[PDB]
């Protein structure tokens, strides 16, 4: 009889995981402050990692990797890529980004140095500013509006002016991939992804057709749910489209780059967050957001450390979390692609 506690009520993913554990009749839920647990479905902010693994005779497991915020924060991800030799500033799959601290508090002069090179060389000089405190995103081709908007920590990265547009619609999209890292640091890519598509035609000359967020398309877009249900296209349809329109598959044109990027990011921070020889063990589910340009090149946008799932895929993914991440440590009485690597 295993014990677990729930400390994030707003987690739609682990509310289903907690539901599955009880349904096995072999997991008993405790109060959120009971320290005698086997599994902690912890909170997002200030998870007390320092109190884990100190109960005698209890193998303790937590659903978050301490230190993984370095990958799941806007400014932290930019610094991590520029300062890690494994990724380097010459990284080919991450857009040219810069960390800009507001003036009421940095890479301001370095950002404008590369900005003037694009303005002079007739190249497309459109950038985008964003931060982790968003629902507030500004897309502009003038550097003055970007630096003034931040003063009112943010990152300014190159806006992908040539995105792959789905037809019919001439519309933008993005790919969400769910990745589960277990206590042995095995990297499992969920076989099912989602394309959160824009329902408005992409206009290169209004942010509704430029931001593919599921909440923006359901609040400010008038074509919501027209082409696909909920602006969510799954891999089967998107693969069928790539074969008919581009004469290629999702695996060849996109998924190889996605698997490469997931491995590079997670292997980079492995020595900093691994719980291999630690007094407690961690797993964590990650949400990777990708962009595909018109040349079928995949770009990493951001990594979500507390991601939600698609309604159609909640049951399958949450069962997989119990299978490989929970029952592998606490055995009872594949839907993932294992991205192999060197520990």
């Amino acid at each position: 009889m295993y014990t677990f506690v729930v400390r994030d009520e707003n987690s739609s993913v682990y509310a289903e995981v907690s539901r599955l554990l009880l349904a096995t009749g072999q997991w008993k839920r405790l109060r959120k402050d009971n320290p005698r647990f086997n599994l902690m479905l912890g909170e997002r902010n200030r998870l007390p990692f320092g109190r884990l693994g100190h109960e005698p005779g209890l193998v303790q497991l937590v659903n978050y990797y301490r230190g993984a915020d370095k990958l799941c924060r806007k400014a932290s991800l930019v610094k991590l890529i520029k300062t890690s030799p494994e990724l380097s500033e010459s990284c080919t799959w991450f857009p040219e980004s810069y960390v800009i601290y507001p003036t009421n508090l940095d890479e301001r002069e370095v950002f404008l140095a590369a900005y003037n090179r694009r303005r002079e060389g007739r190249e497309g000089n459109v950038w985008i500013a964003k931060s982790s405190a968003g629902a507030g995103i500004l897309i502009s081709s003038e550097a003055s509006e970007l630096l003034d908007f931040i003063d009112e920590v943010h990152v300014i990265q190159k806006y992908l002016e040539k995105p792959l547009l789905l037809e019919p619609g001439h519309r933008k999209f993005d790919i969400r991939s769910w990745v589960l890292v277990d206590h042995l640091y095995n990297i499992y890519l969920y076989r099912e992804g989602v394309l959160r598509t824009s329902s408005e035609p992409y206009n290169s000359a209004d942010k509704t057709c430029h931001l593919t967020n599921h909440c923006i398309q359901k609040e400010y877009s008038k074509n919501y749910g027209r082409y696909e249900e909920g602006n969510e296209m799954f891999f089967e349809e998107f693969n069928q489209y790539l074969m008919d329109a581009l004469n290629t598959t999702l695996e060849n044109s996109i998924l190889l780059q996605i698997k490469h990027i997931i491995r590079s990011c997670l292997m980079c921070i492995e020595p900093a967050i691994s719980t291999k020889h630690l007094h407690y063990q961690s797993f964590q589910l990650f949400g990777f957001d990708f962009m595909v340009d018109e040349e079928l090149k995949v770009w990493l946008i951001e990594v979500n450390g507390a991601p939600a799932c698609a309604q159609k895929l909640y049951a399958e993914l949450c069962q997989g979390i119990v299978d490989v991440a929970i029952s592998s440590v606490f055995p009872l009485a594949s839907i993932f692609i294992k991205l192999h690597h060197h520990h």
């Binding site: 007390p48 990692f49 100190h54 005698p56 020889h277």
Partner: protein, 438 residues
């Protein structure tokens, strides 16, 4: 030559003191009767080992040590033990009734009645010293004597020896080997009143020693004897610089200079390697690189925590055995490329290294196997604040209900001292977070 006086308080302090002095005698070639053949200056001298041993005209080498306990059965083990001939009765101080795991009983009720006797016996040892460095204080956090009387003694030592340094070896409480429940109270009470009186304190979590004994020594249920032998090895590696010829950590002041930039943050993390089972007939001897890399494994730390999620203020590597500086620098360069070692911005990123060529001594018939080289790392990392957060949380759980508080109030303590001590720990926890987190 400058002398050091060791003070052992309570059961944990006394039994660990007994383990350390046994090991000291084995390292210095001192027999149980006190005789030291290799010592040619009979009846005196100012050698390095004389910092811990005085000498009689008859040739006996007497530990500069005081044993104090509020109950006699543990110190009676010293009086009739193998090394009974080392000590004279003036060094062994026992009461008749202990503090019953009650800080207030050790600090106020019983401590007030014996504190002057202890200070007098300490004064007798200080009178034999031509240049006293200070004191090494061994005690538990959880015992009523180890917590209550120690803090009272530390207050008076700052009064009677204001210029002297004071270092602690403190046993942090672990439920796996403890049959008590009020130890979070005693630990926080004693840390509060001792904080301004201690220059450098080495915390040893019994949880960490227990698991090292189980994992590396294959002891299913480690005893206090198993724990104290391992602890004495760590203590010996820390004090070896005071007892042998050398240039690093040669006096107590150098410990604070090398390890404690901010006075309140004076709890260095100790890590030791290798710990090898003596039942293994033949074990492959680890290299300098392997034992140095092991200094950054949490499984070898005296307190379980994650230094990856903190910042270092100072680092000292103390090697014993067949070690040359070239191999040390080669290991450090490899470790920097593979380990997450972040120093604070206002400190240099470096390592002070000490090497003593004599390999680690083990107790004959013990559980620790003889090794060719060993290292103890002393690092002042903010990650050790995880141990304060655990302790302070257990304090808060009980104190919110005032559980067990009546035992302390009944001995003359006020409830305000509880919250005063807890507020000091809250400020200590905030100091660590300001130093080690961005």
């Amino acid at each position: 030559m400058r002398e050091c006086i060791s003070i052992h308080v309570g059961q944990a302090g006394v039994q660990i003191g007994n383990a350390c002095w046994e090991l000291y005698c084995l390292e210095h070639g001192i027999q149980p009767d006190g005789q030291m053949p290799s010592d040619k200056t009979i009846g005196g001298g100012d050698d390095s080992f004389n910092t811990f041993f005085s000498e009689t005209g008859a040739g006996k080498h007497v530990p500069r040590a005081v044993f104090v306990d509020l109950e006699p059965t543990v110190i009676d083990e010293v009086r009739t033990g193998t090394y009974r001939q080392l000590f004279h009765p003036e060094q062994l101080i026992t009461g008749k009734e202990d503090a019953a795991n009650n800080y207030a009983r050790g600090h106020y009720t019983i401590g007030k009645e014996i504190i002057d006797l202890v200070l007098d016996r300490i004064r007798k040892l200080a009178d034999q010293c031509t240049g006293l460095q200070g004191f090494l204080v061994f005690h538990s956090f959880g015992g009523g004597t180890g917590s209550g009387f120690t803090s009272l003694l530390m207050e008076r030592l700052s009064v009677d020896y204001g210029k002297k340094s004071k270092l602690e070896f403190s046993i942090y409480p672990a439920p796996q080997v403890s049959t008590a429940v009020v130890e979070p109270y005693n630990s926080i009470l004693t840390t509060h009143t001792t904080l301004e009186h201690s220059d450098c304190a080495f915390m040893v979590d019994n949880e960490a020693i227990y698991d090292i004994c189980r994992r590396n020594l294959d002891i299913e249920r480690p005893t206090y004897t198993n724990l104290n032998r391992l602890i004495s090895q760590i203590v010996s590696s820390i004090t070896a610089s005071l007892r042998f010829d050398g240039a690093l950590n040669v006096d107590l002041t150098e410990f604070q200079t090398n390890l404690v930039p901010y006075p309140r943050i004076h709890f260095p993390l100790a890590t030791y390697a290798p710990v090898i089972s003596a039942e293994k007939a033949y074990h492959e001897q680890l290299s300098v690189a392997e034992i140095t890399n092991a200094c950054f494994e949490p499984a070898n730390q005296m307190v379980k925590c994650d230094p990856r999620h903190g910042k270092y203020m100072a680092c000292c590597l103390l090697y014993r055995g067949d070690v040359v500086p070239k191999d040390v620098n080669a290991a450090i360069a490899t470790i920097k490329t593979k380990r997450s070692i972040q120093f604070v911005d206002w400190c240099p990123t470096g390592f002070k290294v000490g090497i003593n060529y004599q390999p680690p001594t083990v107790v004959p018939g013990g559980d620790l196997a003889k090794v060719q080289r060993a290292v103890c790392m002393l690092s002042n990392t903010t990650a050790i604040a995880e141990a304060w957060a655990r302790l302070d949380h257990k304090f808060d759980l009980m104190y919110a209900k005032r559980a067990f508080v009546h035992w302390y109030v009944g001995e003359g303590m006020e409830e305000g001292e509880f919250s005063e001590a807890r507020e000091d720990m809250a400020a200590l926890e905030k100091d660590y977070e300001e130093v080690g987190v961005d």
